[PDB]
Design a protein around this motif. Structure first.
Motif, PDB file in Angstrom:
ATOM      1  N   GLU A 290      11.783  13.939 -11.951  1.00 27.59           N
ATOM      2  CA  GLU A 290      11.744  14.274 -13.369  1.00 27.59           C
ATOM      3  C   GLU A 290      12.372  13.176 -14.221  1.00 27.59           C
ATOM      4  O   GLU A 290      13.477  12.713 -13.944  1.00 27.59           O
ATOM      5  CB  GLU A 290      12.457  15.609 -13.626  1.00 27.59           C
ATOM      6  CG  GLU A 290      11.674  16.839 -13.171  1.00 27.59           C
ATOM      7  CD  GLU A 290      10.360  17.019 -13.925  1.00 27.59           C
ATOM      8  OE1 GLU A 290      10.316  16.734 -15.143  1.00 27.59           O
ATOM      9  OE2 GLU A 290       9.366  17.446 -13.297  1.00 27.59           O
ATOM     10  N   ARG A 291      11.651  12.759 -15.256  1.00 24.53           N
ATOM     11  CA  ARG A 291      12.163  11.781 -16.206  1.00 24.53           C
ATOM     12  C   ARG A 291      13.189  12.439 -17.118  1.00 24.53           C
ATOM     13  O   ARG A 291      13.179  13.655 -17.298  1.00 24.53           O
ATOM     14  CB  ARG A 291      11.022  11.181 -17.029  1.00 24.53           C
ATOM     15  CG  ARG A 291       9.867  10.658 -16.194  1.00 24.53           C
ATOM     16  CD  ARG A 291      10.092   9.219 -15.772  1.00 24.53           C
ATOM     17  NE  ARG A 291       9.912   8.295 -16.888  1.00 24.53           N
ATOM     18  CZ  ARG A 291      10.105   6.985 -16.808  1.00 24.53           C
ATOM     19  NH1 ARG A 291      10.489   6.436 -15.663  1.00 24.53           N
ATOM     20  NH2 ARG A 291       9.916   6.221 -17.874  1.00 24.53           N
TER      21      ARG A 291
ATOM     22  N   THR B 229      11.656   8.253 -22.763  1.00 29.80           N
ATOM     23  CA  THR B 229      12.115   8.774 -21.485  1.00 29.80           C
ATOM     24  C   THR B 229      12.620   7.671 -20.576  1.00 29.80           C
ATOM     25  O   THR B 229      12.262   6.504 -20.733  1.00 29.80           O
ATOM     26  CB  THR B 229      11.006   9.544 -20.748  1.00 29.80           C
ATOM     27  OG1 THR B 229       9.857   8.701 -20.595  1.00 29.80           O
ATOM     28  CG2 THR B 229      10.628  10.791 -21.522  1.00 29.80           C
ATOM     29  N   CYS B 230      13.462   8.057 -19.625  1.00 32.23           N
ATOM     30  CA  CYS B 230      13.972   7.139 -18.618  1.00 32.23           C
ATOM     31  C   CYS B 230      13.891   7.788 -17.246  1.00 32.23           C
ATOM     32  O   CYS B 230      14.068   8.997 -17.114  1.00 32.23           O
ATOM     33  CB  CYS B 230      15.413   6.738 -18.933  1.00 32.23           C
ATOM     34  SG  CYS B 230      15.623   5.891 -20.513  1.00 32.23           S
ATOM     35  N   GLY B 231      13.610   6.984 -16.228  1.00 29.88           N
ATOM     36  CA  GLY B 231      13.615   7.469 -14.862  1.00 29.88           C
ATOM     37  C   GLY B 231      14.959   7.195 -14.223  1.00 29.88           C
ATOM     38  O   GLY B 231      15.313   7.775 -13.199  1.00 29.88           O
ATOM     39  N   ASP B 232      15.713   6.301 -14.849  1.00 22.06           N
ATOM     40  CA  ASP B 232      17.021   5.902 -14.356  1.00 22.06           C
ATOM     41  C   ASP B 232      17.838   5.320 -15.497  1.00 22.06           C
ATOM     42  O   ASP B 232      17.322   5.107 -16.593  1.00 22.06           O
ATOM     43  CB  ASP B 232      16.882   4.883 -13.225  1.00 22.06           C
ATOM     44  CG  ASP B 232      16.022   3.698 -13.617  1.00 22.06           C
ATOM     45  OD1 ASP B 232      16.570   2.588 -13.776  1.00 22.06           O
ATOM     46  OD2 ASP B 232      14.797   3.885 -13.783  1.00 22.06           O
TER      47      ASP B 232
ATOM     48  N   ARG C 123      20.755  12.382 -11.481  1.00 22.30           N
ATOM     49  CA  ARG C 123      20.057  11.206 -11.986  1.00 22.30           C
ATOM     50  C   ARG C 123      20.384   9.967 -11.164  1.00 22.30           C
ATOM     51  O   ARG C 123      21.467   9.851 -10.596  1.00 22.30           O
ATOM     52  CB  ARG C 123      20.413  10.958 -13.454  1.00 22.30           C
ATOM     53  CG  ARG C 123      20.251  12.169 -14.358  1.00 22.30           C
ATOM     54  CD  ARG C 123      18.820  12.675 -14.371  1.00 22.30           C
ATOM     55  NE  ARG C 123      18.643  13.756 -15.337  1.00 22.30           N
ATOM     56  CZ  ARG C 123      17.469  14.288 -15.665  1.00 22.30           C
ATOM     57  NH1 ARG C 123      16.353  13.841 -15.105  1.00 22.30           N
ATOM     58  NH2 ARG C 123      17.413  15.267 -16.558  1.00 22.30           N
TER      59      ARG C 123
END
Length: 246
Positions: A56-57, A95-98, A158
């Motif tokens: 999940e982003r 959005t960010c994935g990390d 995260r």
DNA sequence: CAGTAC
DNA sequence: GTACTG
């Protein structure tokens, strides 16, 4: 039905195609099959228990809270340190994935020794929940990949990346960590044409090469105080991170 | 090699 | 395109 299974396995952190295929040949079809029967690295073990969350982003706002959590802890050790979030965040997309965090000090001396107890400090908050990799021996910089989680009800795990760089290399480090990957490739690809070299440490000129273009020369390093210097030395118009989202 | 960071 | 550790 094989292709979806390779997808399912590849979304595990630490597992790629070669591993997904091997797991398939062993007759594994589900995540439960992997968890109970397969040989997992500690990495793969961690990615598997955080499978949903890692998939999940995260909103830009939550990435800020994550950086500030890092930032506050780091500065407690020292006021001087800079904690600037990079990657998707700095490029400004929603959005960010990390969360990628670069850390440095203006002098170029006070950054040493922080990395080890910064991580230790975060673990005491209950912030850091798992560790994936450590690269203490990386030139003059250290890189950490781990798992954090903000304080509060109903929060997800995260992926967090921390690197600590000297101020002499702060420019090329930011240029690396903000990306994007396709963008970084293209820029470094152009360096080879101009007989130069670009890494997360420094930009280098007078770089020797052979008939087949294989590198045999280290070249000499040109000082770059900020991102505009390396852009200029490459004969290119500077581009903002938002413009760097290739 | 395989997987990963950007 | 560099550059790590697994």
């Amino acid at each position: 039905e094989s292709v979806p299974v390779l997808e399912l396995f590849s979304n595990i952190w630490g597992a790629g195609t070669k591993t997904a295929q091997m797991w398939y040949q062993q007759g594994f079809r589900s995540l439960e099959d992997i968890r109970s029967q397969a040989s997992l690295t500690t990495q793969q073990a961690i990615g598997l228990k955080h499978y949903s969350d890692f998939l999940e982003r995260m909103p830009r706002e939550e990435a800020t809270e994550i950086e500030q959590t890092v930032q506050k802890a780091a500065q407690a050790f020292n006021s001087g340190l800079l904690c600037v979030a990079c990657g998707s965040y700095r490029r400004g997309k929603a959005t960010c994935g990390d969360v990628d965090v670069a850390i440095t000090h203006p002098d170029g001396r006070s950054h040493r020794g922080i990395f080890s107890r910064l991580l230790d400090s975060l673990r005491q908050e209950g912030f850091l929940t798992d560790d994936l990799v450590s690269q203490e021996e990386n030139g003059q910089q250290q890189k950490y990949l781990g798992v954090c989680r903000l304080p509060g009800p109903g929060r997800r795990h995260r992926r967090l990346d921390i690197i600590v760089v000297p101020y002499s290399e702060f420019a090329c480090a930011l240029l690396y960590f903000t990306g994007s990957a396709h963008f970084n490739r293209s820029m470094r690809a152009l360096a080879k044409t101009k007989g130069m070299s670009l890494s997360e440490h420094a930009l280098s000129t007078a770089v020797v090469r052979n008939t087949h273009g294989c590198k045999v020369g280290p070249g000499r390093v040109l000082p770059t105080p900020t991102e505009k210097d390396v852009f200029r030395l490459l004969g290119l118009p500077y581009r903002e991170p938002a413009e760097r989202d290739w």
